[PDB]
């Protein structure tokens, strides 16, 4: 309507195109798979030990670092597999962050700090796209791992995914599409209250502009849903709880399984996290 809100449309469009380039499996594609509507993907359903073994062809367990984890018992292999998907998520999120206007002009130390605290909140936000109450798409939608199967793993691995499923059923109720999520994840990255930020001001400047864009996007894209903007900001704190819980569980897992080691990218992110 006006030049000010016109600039917020361009920003929303820029972030959407950037999100499409950065993330191979979008919520649009993910939802098409989960509802059965014809797609490239035939997801092999993993519901038990036997199905996982018969489905090893379709899951790339082969790429997990380090290699000795690839030989271990099922629960450790599944956990490491989920953690490894997170490594590939970090790379995609990092490339997306670089496309956010003003982000690469921030103090490089602050770019590192924003990503370090942002990535898992974004991982679990976007994972909700791949989830229903029954299970989660894995290996770019070539696998579907059942919720019950992930519940059944021995302690301390038995409930590591339950908090993500519980956050996902509520979050997916908002019926956000890719274009909304593209702006929401940029808002999460540009959080001025992360510990050890050197220069908060230019981060809050960028986030203020992203939040306005997100608000305009949720007015236009969901004009019949009225307080969608307000409900979404409440979730940004439910996300932090998931990440604190996940890091705490990872601490338990590292100390109960003393000869488990993590991908060095995850070691560097998890170190001095909550």
């Amino acid at each position: 309507l006006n030049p000010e809100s016109a600039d917020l449309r361009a920003l929303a469009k820029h972030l959407y195109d950037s999100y499409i380039k950065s993330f191979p499996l979008t919520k649009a594609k993910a939802r098409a798979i989960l509802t059965g509507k014809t797609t490239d993907k035939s997801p092999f359903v993993i519901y038990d030990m036997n199905s996982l073994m018969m489905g090893e062809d379709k899951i790339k367990f082969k790429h997990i670092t380090p290699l000795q984890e690839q030989s271990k018992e099922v629960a450790i292999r599944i956990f490491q597999g989920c953690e490894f998907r997170s490594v590939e998520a970090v790379q995609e999120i990092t490339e997306y962050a670089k496309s956010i206007p003003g982000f690469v002009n921030l103090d490089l130390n602050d770019q590192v700090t924003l990503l370090k605290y942002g990535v898992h909140e974004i991982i679990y936000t976007m994972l909700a796209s791949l989830m229903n109450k029954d299970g989660v798409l894995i290996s770019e939608g070539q696998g579907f791992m059942t919720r019950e199967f992930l519940k059944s793993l021995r302690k301390p691995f038995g409930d590591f995914m339950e908090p993500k499923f519980e956050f996902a059923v509520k979050f997916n109720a908002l019926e956000l599409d890719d274009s909304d999520l593209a702006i929401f994840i940029a808002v999460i990255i540009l959080s001025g209250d992360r510990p050890g930020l050197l220069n908060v001001k230019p981060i809050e400047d960028i986030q203020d502009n992203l939040l306005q864009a997100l608000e305009l996007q949720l007015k236009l894209n969901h004009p019949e849903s009225s307080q969608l903007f307000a409900k979404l900001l409440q979730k940004m704190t439910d996300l932090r709880q998931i990440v604190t819980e996940h890091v705490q569980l990872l601490q338990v897992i590292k100390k109960t399984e003393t000869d488990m080691s993590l991908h060095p990218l995850l070691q560097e992110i998890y170190k001095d996290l909550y």
Binding site: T94, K98, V104, Q111, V112
Partner: peptide
């Protein structure tokens, strides 16, 4: 240091 993150952000 965050060597890998630094490297992801510079390439």
């Amino acid at each position: 240091r965050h060597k890998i993150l630094h490297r992801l952000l510079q390439e």
